[PDB]
Design a protein around this ligand. Structure first.
Ligand code: MN
Ligand code: MN
Ligand code: MN
Ligand code: MN
Lengths: 198, 198, 198, 198
C-alpha cells in the first residue's frame, strides 16, 4: 500500500546545513520504519474493523497516529527542502507572511520559537487556516500530523526530533533551526499554499 | 454493525439508588447517541481506509474512541448493575479481592477513591491484569475504554460522568458511589472475572 | 487566600434561560469547592516549593490546574452573563467580530459548534490573540483555563460541563447553547476586549 | 536552588556500552539545562504563587514538570549505572522480581518492551507500588517523573530519549537496551528498593 518516496535530491545535497548521514538515516531508516508499521497497523485495523472489534481498533490508534503521522510528516518534509532553496519566498506567499506575521524576519522568529519550544519529540509547522483564510504557526507532539489533528494545512514543516539534528548539532537545537532556512524549498511551500485557496 | 442493547431490568428498577429518569436518559439518549455515531465513524473509517487517507483516519480517531468507547463502557455498565445486586461477591472473586486489596472494604474505598478522583468526565474501574495475574483498579477520562487504552479487562465499571448522577445526587458524587454498591451485579462481575482465568 | 466571588445578580436573574436551581448550585457548590481546594493546594505548594520538593510540586499540579482553573473560569463566567443581557455587541467589538468571522450570526455558529464539539467536560471560548491582534475561538478541556493553557485572553466563556445545563435542558446541549445567547453581558465582553487593545 | 550532581564515575567509565561523548553531553549539557531551567521556573513560581496569580502558576506548569522532572530523572539515572555493575541483583530484590515477573530474564523483557514501546521521548521504569507492596513497571512520557506523575517509587530508570543513544546506536533503540543491562548498578537499585519496605 504505502511506499517510502524517493528523495528529490541526494543525501548530501543539503550540506553543510544538514549532513548526508542525518539525511541517509532519517530517510532510509526512520521514515522507512514508519511506512512499514503503518501498513501493518492499517491491515490490523482493517481486520478489526471488518470484525467489529472496537477494543482492537482503539488499541491500534497510537500506532496508526504515530506511524501514519510519521509517514505524512516526513513525506512533506522532504519536499520542503532543496539544494536550490533558501532566501525568502516569492509571490503571494511572502505577502501573506507579511500580513499574518508582520515581516519575513518576524515569521522566521515565531516558527523558530515554536520549533525550539517543543518539549520532547515534535514538529514546528507553518500552516494555512482554511476557515480563517490566513497562515498559522503550530507545533505538534511526536508524530502527530498537522491536518489530521488541527485541521490546518501543512505548508512548511521543520522536524525537531533529536534524530533530525543530534549527530551534527548535538543538543544545540537553535543552531539546527538557523541552518535549515538555507535549504527551504519556497517553490514547494508556495505550491501547497496556492493549493489551499483552491 | 452495532446495536443498542436492552437493559436486563426496566428504567426504575434501581430505585432508590439510581432514579428512573437517570436510567432512561442515560440509556435512551447518551448510549443511543454513542452507537449511531460509532457506526457512522466506522463506515467513514472503512471509506478512508479504502482510499489510504491517513489524515482522514487520524481526524476520525477522537470520534471512534469517544463513541466506540462510550458504547463499550455503557454496555458493560448495564450488566454490572441489577435490582437483585448489592452485598459482596463470593468464591475466588472475593479471595482475589482480599489478596489484592486486603479486604472488601479496602477494595471499596480504593475503587470509591478512584471514582471520586476523576476530574471532569470519567470512569472508575476494577479490572484484571492478565499479565501479572491479579486485580487492578483504574480510572479513565471521558469515554476512554478500559481495555483499548490500558490493556486491563473490565470487570466492574462505575460511570462518574455528571449525567450518571447529577439529576439525583447533584454535586455530591460520593453519595452516588455510596448508593451504587447496593445495585452491583456481583454475579456479572464474577462471570467477567472467571472469563479472565479460563 | 482565594475567595468565592459574589454573583453580580440574583440566582434567578437569568430565567428562563438558566434556571435558578442551576445558578444556586453552580455558584454555591461547584464554584465553592474549587476556591476551597485551590487554597488547600497553594498552601501545600508553598510548602513543597520551600523544601525544594520537586515531586510534591509536580504531584500537586493536577489539583492546582483543576481547582485554580475552576475558579478562574467561573469567575469570568459569572461576569459574562447578565439579567440585562442578550442582543448583539456594538462598535469596536461588533466590528472586530465582523472582520474575524464575517458576521455576528457566523460568530455565533462558530462559538456554538466549538462548545458543542466538547467531548466530555470543558468550555467554549471567544478569546483574543495579542500576538496576532485578532479574535480566536477555542475549546478547553475540563477546567483548563483559556489564558493559562492557550495563552489567549478570555473574552466570552460558555461552560459545557453537564452540571451547567443538565437539570434544565437534560442531555440537549444545543438548546442550552441557543438559550445562553439571551443572557450574554456584551458590556462585559467589550471591556475584556478593550483591555486587550489597551 | 538545585544543582547538577557530580557523576559518580568518569564519562568513559561505561564504555563500550555507553560511549564517553554521550555521557559527556548528557550530563554536562542536557541534565545541566534542566537544573537551570528548574531554578528559573521555581523562582518564578514562588513569585506568582505569592501574588496569588493562578494563571501564571498554571502557565509555568509544563516548564516545571519538564525541567523538574528532567532533574529528578537524570539524578536517579546516574546512580543506576556503574562501570563495576551488571549481572543480576540478589537477596530480596531478585526474589521480588522472580515473584512479580516470573524470573530475572522475564523482568528484563518486560522492562525492555516498556522502554522500546515509548513513542518519542520518554523513560522506562521499574518501580515499587507501596500501596500494593510489589514491583511495577511503568513508562513515562518526556521528562514526566515516575513518583510525581505515577506515585510509584523509582528503583531503576532507562532514558530512552534519542540523546541517550542515537549518537552511538543511531536508530536502533533495542541495541542500546541490550547494552545498558551491562552497566546497571544493581547495588543502587537494591538500596532504593530496601528503602521502600522501610
Ligand atoms: Mn523525523
Ligand atoms: Mn455515561
Ligand atoms: Mn461549571
Ligand atoms: Mn536524558
Amino acid at each position: 500500500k504505502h511506499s517510502l518516496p524517493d528523495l528529490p535530491y541526494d543525501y548530501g545535497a543539503l550540506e553543510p546545513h544538514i549532513n548526508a548521514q542525518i539525511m541517509q538515516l532519517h530517510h532510509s531508516k526512520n521514515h522507512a520504519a514508519y511506512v512499514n508499521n503503518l501498513n501493518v497497523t492499517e491491515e490490523k485495523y482493517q481486520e478489526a474493523l471488518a470484525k467489529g472489534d472496537v477494543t482492537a481498533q482503539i488499541a491500534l490508534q497510537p500506532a496508526l497516529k504515530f506511524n501514519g503521522g510519521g509517514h505524512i510528516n516526513h513525506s512533506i518534509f522532504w519536499t520542503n527542502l532543496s539544494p536550490n532553496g533558501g532566501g525568502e519566498p516569492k509571490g503571494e506567499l511572502l505577502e501573506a507572511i507579511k500580513r499574518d506575521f508582520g515581516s519575513f524576519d518576524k515569521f522566521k522568529e515565531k516558527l523558530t520559537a515554536a520549533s525550539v519550544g517543543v518539549q520532547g519529540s515534535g514538529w514546528g509547522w507553518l500552516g494555512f487556516n482554511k476557515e480563517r483564510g490566513h497562515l498559522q504557526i503550530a507545533a505538534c507532539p511526536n508524530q502527530d500530523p498537522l491536518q489530521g489533528t488541527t485541521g490546518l494545512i501543512p505548508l512548511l514543516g521543520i522536524d525537531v526530533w533529536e534524530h533530525a539534528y543530534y549527530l551534527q548539532y548535538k543538543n544545540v537545537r537553535p543552531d539546527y533551526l538557523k541552518a535549515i532556512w538555507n535549504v527551504i524549498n519556497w517553490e514547494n511551500v508556495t505550491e501547497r499554499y496556492m493549493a489551499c485557496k483552491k
